[PDB]
Design a protein around this ligand. Structure first.
Ligand SMILES: O=CCCCC[C@@H]1SC[C@@H]2NC(=O)N[C@@H]21
Ligand SMILES: O=CCCCC[C@@H]1SC[C@@H]2NC(=O)N[C@@H]21
Lengths: 68, 138, 566, 169, 177, 43
């Protein structure tokens, strides 16, 4: 989930691809704060947002679920 | 090159654990071959003790060197007798059993046997007075 | 559930979770970063060479260093004249003095780099070093501090950067109980900046204060008098357990040879005025009278031998150890470092750096799910257990709590600490301020300052503002400081200060473009005019400057330096 | 001999835990060759060693004319004085207040001729430099000898200082 | 000191995880509570999941409680061992107690210790001995007697027990002054 | 000046100035002294 400022962009992960190592799933910018999330939850990650879309605080940017 | 290297290693940890800042190492040996002093300079580039170079008689090259077990810690008159391996860049390789002492370095291998005398540098280190001593003595 | 080991296997195997497996893929991003780093080290590694053998660089291809062209012939002439005298003009005295096959540090280097601006607008004072060279040296099995006065007297013996370097060396030696060796060659004083160097405190008197406080604590010190030490410089030979005066060119004076003239000017030979007087004079001044440079250095070594510190150092630091290298190649350290001059902060990682530096590429994480911003845990550095604080992101209250807890444990069990500085990163949100963030920051700083554990910090990059107060800073007694090339030490904001100070400075609403040209560009120039290369080290702010690739060796030197301590 | 007497006094004062007061003056190191041959440097070191080693609380007040390295013999800011105070007629300068002018006149790129213009450019200039500093500006304003007082009310100030230094451990 | 929280520790039992240099909470069944799940009922009984009431909450909650979150029993035990490792006591114990020692056995078989012990439930006290017991227990079957002719009732002297010098007081008879 | 060792050799050799080389010549003077000493120890 990203903080209030949102403005997600430059997502470098493909939807529905396994993420065991903690790569930068999404990078959100808050006052020049890239603050990459770097999730380490295993399983494929499904994106519900698009680059350049301003999102609210603690929004569900993606659901990191076990590969089923 | 092999004779000079053996005297250091077969005496101490020269080139072992050595480290400087934003620079590179250097250590030199003086040989008194015949009646003419001979200087050999050895240095390293990178983080490699292995990669070593040389410049004697205006001839430069590279080689690597792998030693053997360390022996003769007491370093007496017999000093240290160890086998050495040298991989020069051209492609060769050599094995040298070097019994080195302060007086000389002896290298035996397929080349044959050669003993190189180390340039002597001793002269009453301390009592070196050239004062005239003109008057007011005893 | 079908799992019943005995902890090992799970442990003592090449598959323990303790290690780290960040393997890079050398992509453009890597290249962009890796390449820049390379672009950030070549000259660092180079200027060193130029100041070394300062002003005499026969290659004349030193364009990789932005240093201005200097009259090489004048420096070569001076060096020839000095070496004709019979004394070695170089740092040669040092590597002659230290045992072969041993290590060295060169504590402060590039000191006084292009510091003073002369009357000539395009000319700076040519202080290739601070006038001295300082490094930790291991003599005869004894670890010692080495301070050597360079023969550069063209500008004057000592500057506000020279006495500070000497005093930093003395404080380090006293803290660490390493005996000092001073190589003394002076032109007296500097009668131009004398108000800046003589009076007040932390000046030339504090050298004399320290040389007595050390001998109170029975930390023997040694000085070698190669040339004249006048103008209060003659007290160090007098205040010394052992002192060496060279037979011909070693001189010590409280009053100069010109000074006898105009006040009972019965001038006589400079030998009789206080120089090396080997004629069995009544004065019992100066322990050793040596005929040659090698003789003097040899007697210095011999005196160093009879101190009984060899047993204590050998017991405390094991001489015969098996080096354990990390699992990943240390050349990769430049790659994970991002680029520079990027409008918005780039991304960064820490795991990779610690996995590249530590032994066996391992780590001992405390709570990482919680306060995900800050990183703390144990490690191993060449046979010694270490604690590391490396910063990543914008600090929270919980990060400060975790830091305080870690420092508490480390002080409790006597574990050294390592610091890897980063951005300030204090959130300004109103809810965070209402949540008592100031109290938690105080909680952190209190523990940081109160810790009796030895502390070393190294700049990763982007250390700007009051955030360093949370982790560590020069004003918090770090026994050593070292720096990487991509470092900026500035106000509470590196980039934001520009935006904030744009608003509140006598600006009309109109002329917006000319104003941002005059405001934002100017403040950017001010806040990145300072950098690792100039504002630091040259002014003995974070005196040590290193390469990112060779950090573990340096930190291991530091830790061996801080175990002779009481 | 003055240095020996000073060392002996400081030894007694440290032995019996008696506070010390300093009243600074000129440097006054003789430059005679016989004095240098008599081990004067050793005796100066004897004095400075005792000065710095003393755990006794120490306060100094400038009488006047404290210029040069002589203060190292008595006391100085770099020797941890728990307080410093100053009188108006104070000058803190190089090893020579007046002689530095004469000595530095000789050894500075001077032609033999143009003597009057040279002494106007050398001696007057160095006098201006070495008395441009004074009690009022170079000191206190820069927290060199932070306290500035009147000569008439010195005992009250020193009594404040001594009462300040008896809560000490 | 180190504590591992395998299950619930309520009713003042939750302070040990709080008062601990290192503490371990298992991912699923590790729970810590100051107030019980029944306790929320009858006092603002808005009951919610036992996870949210104080159990193992691996969701990056605001609470910085509990150092280690381990997915399995073996993982938790392994992290406990790893934390125990970083205490620096290994050097001190190894120096104080020599790890590599040569065992010196007694001269007589230790199975005989039951024999010199008399029987039980005997109207009058039976007879007893000590020398045999000490000779069977100590190293090399030896002893260092002090005065034994005098105050023949009580026994005192030095000995050796597996490389360490020991003093033994063994009682035999009716005590005198 | 054509002298560049590393302190040892100058040290760790059988030729360091640290040692002492007073070798006696056993002359009458030596005998007079040596003999007396012998005359001062026997009993
Ligand atoms: O949106 C939240 C980001 C807050 C960042 C605050 C830090 S404090 C120092 C620096 N100067 C700023 O204006 N922002 C950062
Ligand atoms: O009687 C003649 C001797 C004069 C000594 C003058 C002293 S020496 C040190 C100090 N520096 C000066 O310029 N004058 C005094």
């Amino acid at each position: 989930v990203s903080p209030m400022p949102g403005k997600v962009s430059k997502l470098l992960v493909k939807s529905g691809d396994l993420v065991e190592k903690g790569q930068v799933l999404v990078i959100v910018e808050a006052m020049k704060m890239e603050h990459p999330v770097r999730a380490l939850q295993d399983g494929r990650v499904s994106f519900l947002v698009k680059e350049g879309e301003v999102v609210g605080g603690d929004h569900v940017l993606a659901t990191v679920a076990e590969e089923e | 090159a092999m004779a000079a290297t053996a005297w250091l290693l077969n005496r101490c940890d020269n080139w072992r654990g050595a480290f400087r800042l934003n620079s590179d190492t250097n250590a030199t040996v003086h040989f008194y071959i015949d009646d003419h002093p001979v200087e050999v300079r050895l240095h390293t580039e990178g983080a490699n003790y292995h990669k070593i170079f040389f410049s004697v008689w205006d001839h430069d090259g590279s080689f690597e060197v792998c030693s053997g077990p360390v022996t003769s810690k007491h370093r007496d008159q017999k000093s240290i007798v160890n086998d050495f391996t040298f991989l020069f860049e051209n492609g060769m390789h050599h094995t040298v059993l070097a019994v080195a002492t302060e007086g000389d370095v002896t290298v035996i291998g397929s080349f044959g046997l050669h003993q190189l005398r180390l340039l002597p540098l001793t002269d009453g280190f301390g009592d070196s007075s050239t004062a005239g001593g003109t008057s007011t003595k005893i | 559930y079908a799992h019943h080991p005995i902890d090992y296997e799970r442990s003592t195997s090449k598959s323990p979770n303790i290690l780290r497996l960040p393997a890079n893929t050398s992509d453009p991003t890597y290249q962009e970063n890796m390449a820049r780093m390379e672009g950030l080290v070549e000259q660092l590694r180079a200027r060193v060479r130029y100041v070394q053998a300062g002003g005499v660089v026969p290659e004349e291809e030193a364009a990789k260093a932005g240093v201005s062209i200097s009259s090489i012939e004048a420096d070569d002439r001076v060096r020839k004249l000095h070496l004709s005298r019979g004394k070695m003009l170089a740092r040669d005295r040092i590597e002659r003095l230290i045992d072969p096959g041993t290590r060295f540090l060169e504590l402060s280097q590039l000191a006084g780099w292009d510091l003073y601006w002369d009357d000539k607008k395009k000319e700076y004072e040519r202080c290739y070093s601070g006038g001295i060279v300082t490094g930790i040296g291991l003599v005869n099995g004894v670890r010692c501090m080495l301070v050597a006065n360079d023969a550069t007297v063209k500008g004057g013996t000592y500057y506000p950067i020279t006495v500070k370097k000497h005093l930093r060396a003395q404080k380090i030696a006293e803290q660490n109980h390493l005996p000092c060796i001073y190589l003394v060659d002076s032109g007296g004083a500097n009668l131009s900046r004398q108000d800046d160097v003589f009076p007040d405190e932390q000046h030339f008197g504090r050298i004399f204060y320290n040389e007595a406080q050390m001998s109170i604590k029975s930390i023997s010190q040694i000085a070698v008098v190669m040339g004249s030490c006048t103008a209060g410089g003659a007290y160090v030979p007098a205040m010394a357990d052992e002192n060496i005066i060279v037979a011909r060119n070693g001189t010590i004076f409280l009053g100069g040879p010109p000074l006898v003239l105009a006040a009972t000017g019965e001038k006589v030979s400079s030998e009789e005025l206080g120089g090396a007087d080997v004629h069995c004079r009544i004065s019992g001044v100066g322990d050793h009278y040596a005929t040659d440079d090698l003789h003097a250095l040899y007697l210095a070594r011999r005196a160093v031998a009879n101190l009984n510190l060899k047993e204590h150092n050998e017991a405390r630091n094991p001489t015969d150890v098996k080096p354990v290298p990390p699992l990943y190649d240390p050349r990769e350290l430049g790659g994970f470092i991002p680029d520079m001059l990027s409008d918005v902060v780039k991304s960064f990682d820490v795991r990779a750096i610690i996995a590249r530096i530590v032994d066996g590429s391992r780590f001992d994480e405390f709570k990482a799910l919680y306060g995900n911003t800050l990183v703390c845990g144990f490690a191993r550095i060449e046979g010694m257990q270490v604690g590391i604080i490396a910063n990543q992101g914008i600090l929270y209250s919980e990060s400060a709590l975790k830091g305080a807890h870690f420092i508490g444990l480390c002080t409790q069990r006597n574990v050294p600490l390592l610091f890897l500085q980063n951005i300030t990163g204090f959130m300004v949100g109103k809810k965070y301020e209402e949540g008592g963030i100031a109290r938690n920051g105080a909680r952190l700083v209190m523990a940081v300052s109160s810790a009796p554990v030895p502390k070393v910090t190294v700049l990763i990059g982007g250390s700007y503002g009051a955030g360093n107060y949370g982790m560590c800073g020069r004003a918090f007694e770090p026994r050593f400081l070292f720096m990487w090339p991509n470092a900026r030490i500035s106000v509470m904001g590196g980039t934001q200060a520009a935006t904030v100070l744009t608003l509140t400075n006598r600006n009309l609403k109109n002329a917006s473009e000319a104003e941002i040209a005059a405001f934002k560009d100017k403040v950017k120039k001010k806040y990145e005019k300072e950098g690792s290369c100039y504002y630091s080290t040259a002014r003995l702010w974070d005196d040590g400057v290193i390469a990112p690739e060779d950090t573990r060796v340096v930190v291991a030197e530091a830790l061996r330096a801080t175990r002779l301590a009481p």
